[PDB]
Design an enzyme around this catalytic site. Sequence first.
Site, short mmCIF file in Angstrom:
data_model
loop_
_atom_site.label_atom_id
_atom_site.label_comp_id
_atom_site.label_asym_id
_atom_site.label_seq_id
_atom_site.Cartn_x
_atom_site.Cartn_y
_atom_site.Cartn_z
N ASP A 38 -24.95 -54.51 8.08
CA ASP A 38 -25.46 -53.22 8.56
C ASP A 38 -25.51 -52.15 7.46
OD1 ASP A 38 -26.30 -51.15 10.21
OD2 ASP A 38 -24.25 -50.69 10.87
N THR A 40 -18.74 -44.69 16.85
CA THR A 40 -19.95 -44.57 17.69
C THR A 40 -21.15 -45.00 16.88
OG1 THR A 40 -18.85 -42.85 18.84
CG2 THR A 40 -21.23 -43.01 19.24
N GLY A 59 -25.59 -45.94 17.44
CA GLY A 59 -26.75 -45.70 18.30
C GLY A 59 -26.65 -46.54 19.55
N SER A 60 -26.20 -47.79 19.44
CA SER A 60 -26.27 -48.75 20.55
C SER A 60 -25.00 -48.73 21.42
CB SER A 60 -26.64 -50.10 20.09
OG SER A 60 -25.73 -50.56 19.14
N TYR A 106 -25.39 -42.43 4.55
CA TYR A 106 -26.29 -43.55 4.88
C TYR A 106 -26.92 -44.02 3.58
CZ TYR A 106 -25.76 -41.92 9.63
OH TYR A 106 -25.26 -41.55 10.83
N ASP A 135 -32.07 -49.28 7.27
CA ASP A 135 -30.96 -49.71 8.13
C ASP A 135 -31.22 -51.16 8.57
OD1 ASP A 135 -28.86 -50.12 9.75
OD2 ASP A 135 -29.35 -48.47 11.17
N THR A 170 -30.53 -51.98 12.45
CA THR A 170 -31.37 -51.48 13.56
C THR A 170 -32.57 -52.42 13.69
OG1 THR A 170 -30.52 -49.24 13.51
CG2 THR A 170 -32.74 -49.54 14.40
N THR A 171 -32.97 -52.71 14.92
CA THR A 171 -34.03 -53.72 15.15
C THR A 171 -35.39 -53.10 14.82
OG1 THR A 171 -32.66 -54.72 16.83
CG2 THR A 171 -35.03 -55.33 16.76
O1 LIG Z 1 -25.43 -46.25 14.66
C1 LIG Z 1 -25.54 -46.58 13.46
C2 LIG Z 1 -26.62 -47.39 12.96
C3 LIG Z 1 -26.18 -48.86 12.79
O2 LIG Z 1 -27.20 -49.55 12.04
C4 LIG Z 1 -25.97 -49.58 14.13
C5 LIG Z 1 -25.28 -50.94 13.87
C6 LIG Z 1 -24.92 -51.72 15.12
C7 LIG Z 1 -25.86 -52.62 15.64
C8 LIG Z 1 -25.59 -53.39 16.75
C9 LIG Z 1 -24.36 -53.29 17.35
C10 LIG Z 1 -23.40 -52.41 16.83
C11 LIG Z 1 -23.66 -51.62 15.73
N1 LIG Z 1 -27.19 -49.86 14.83
C12 LIG Z 1 -27.45 -49.64 16.12
O3 LIG Z 1 -26.61 -49.07 16.82
C13 LIG Z 1 -28.74 -50.20 16.71
C14 LIG Z 1 -29.50 -49.16 17.50
C15 LIG Z 1 -29.71 -47.96 16.67
C16 LIG Z 1 -30.57 -46.91 17.37
C17 LIG Z 1 -31.04 -45.97 16.28
C18 LIG Z 1 -29.90 -45.19 15.60
C19 LIG Z 1 -29.48 -43.92 16.27
C20 LIG Z 1 -28.04 -43.59 15.82
C21 LIG Z 1 -27.66 -42.12 15.90
C22 LIG Z 1 -26.49 -41.75 16.87
C23 LIG Z 1 -25.17 -42.47 16.67
C24 LIG Z 1 -23.95 -41.70 16.11
C25 LIG Z 1 -23.69 -41.82 14.60
N2 LIG Z 1 -23.53 -43.19 14.22
C26 LIG Z 1 -24.16 -43.83 13.23
O4 LIG Z 1 -25.10 -43.34 12.67
C27 LIG Z 1 -23.60 -45.19 12.79
C28 LIG Z 1 -22.69 -45.04 11.58
C29 LIG Z 1 -21.71 -43.89 11.70
C30 LIG Z 1 -21.99 -42.70 11.02
C31 LIG Z 1 -21.08 -41.58 11.15
C32 LIG Z 1 -19.92 -41.72 11.90
N3 LIG Z 1 -19.69 -42.92 12.54
C33 LIG Z 1 -20.55 -44.05 12.46
N4 LIG Z 1 -24.66 -46.13 12.52
#
Ligand SMILES: O=C1C[C@H](O)[C@H](Cc2ccccc2)NC(=O)CCCCCCCCCCCCCNC(=O)[C@H](Cc2cccnc2)N1
Length: 350
Positions: free
Chosen positions: A34, A76, A78-79, A201, A232, A235-236
Amino acid sequence: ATGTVSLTDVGLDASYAGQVSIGTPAQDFLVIMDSGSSDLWVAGSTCTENFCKQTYTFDTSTSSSFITSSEAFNITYGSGDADGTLGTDTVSMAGFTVSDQTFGVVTSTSANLISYPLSGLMGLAWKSIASSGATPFWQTLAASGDWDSPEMGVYLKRYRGDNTASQIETDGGQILFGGLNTSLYNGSVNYISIDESEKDYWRIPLEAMVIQGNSVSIASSSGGSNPSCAIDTGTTLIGVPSQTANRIYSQIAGAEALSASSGYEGYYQYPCDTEVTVSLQFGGMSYSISNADMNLGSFTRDTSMCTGAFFAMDMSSRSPVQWIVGASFIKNVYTAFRYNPAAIGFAELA
Ligand SMILES: O=C1C[C@H](O)[C@H](Cc2ccccc2)NC(=O)CCCCCCCCCCCCCNC(=O)[C@H](Cc2cccnc2)N1
Ligand SMILES: *[C@@H]1O[C@H](CO)[C@@H](O[C@@H]2O[C@H](CO)[C@@H](O)[C@H](O)[C@H]2NC(C)=O)[C@H](O)[C@H]1NC(C)=O
Ligand SMILES: [Cl-]
Ligand code: NA
């Protein structure tokens, strides 16, 4: 040195996973690789969630090198979200080891976050967005001078559009730690420089986007003149601001927003027999998205309409990114994530 992580393609290009080994002796897991997060975690053997019962879990008790903490782990995405506690143990991936890697031992998630064959996630982005505050595995390697070249090369293989593809494709691509794989790309790498303020990021500016021949306005109230795009691997699809998604789909004759009552709000569908020509411009070059990545097929009983790979999602104004450019884009390029000088590069696939 260099080392290679072989990728498994799960869910028809939903996720790309690689093997991590944790503890003494090694417990092996398939984890999402990721570039959009910075924490390692694995489901703990004490986890009572249904998904934990049906996949491989980390038994902290059988690792002689495991150092426990009471420190909460809460991330947290996105998913959805994952929770448990931090631990420290020896971790190996691609033939490298970090003897004192801090990571999450997860014992609850939101519904359907991951499932078999996955056991967790490995963040490949920068320490500043690590929920644990721990230095990411990859970043320790790059910083220690263990790599021949301070970059990771990424090839994600494509199964979308393959009518005989499996939900688990062990021939899913490759990540090269400490170099780029010259057998998988052709011509020169186009590097887009990342300044010292943007190391969070893996993100770069979008310069332009062309769909059906039309240059789209990529201005947004959140991202101003040009959006910062997370590149990323976890992300799909491709997530863009609502106003931008409306403008993109306005260029495809017959395109429409899926209704809230469909269950698919944020998605858009368009005539299935329209092959969409679309590119994103990064560092002065147009990168095409193939129709096999753009067309996700029919989400409704209306088989004449197909969902596109661009989806609407307004981002918190706390977010430094306005786009999430996922696998739908990345499958079309060989990608270099460069530690120093910090950059993302793209090359044509071989
Ligand atoms: O989610 C993501 C993108 C990541 O590639 C996930 C991986 C994933 C996929 C399948 C299972 C678990 C983890 N990718 C996804 O979640 C896939 C869907 C993404 C939808 C598009 C992204 C929208 C995210 C924005 C809101 C989320 C809050 C911030 N959260 C984020 O930005 C976090 C990192 C992070 C930043 C700061 C503090 N903590 C964690 N990254
Ligand atoms: C770069 O990519 C190539 C092509 O995928 C890799 O080649 C494979 O390597 C294994 C053993 O190293 C061979 O047994 C396979 O036959 C090769 N496959 C093909 C299709 O050529 C190569 O290993 C990669 N190099 C690095 C350093 O990761
Ligand atoms: Cl184009
Ligand atoms: Na901006």
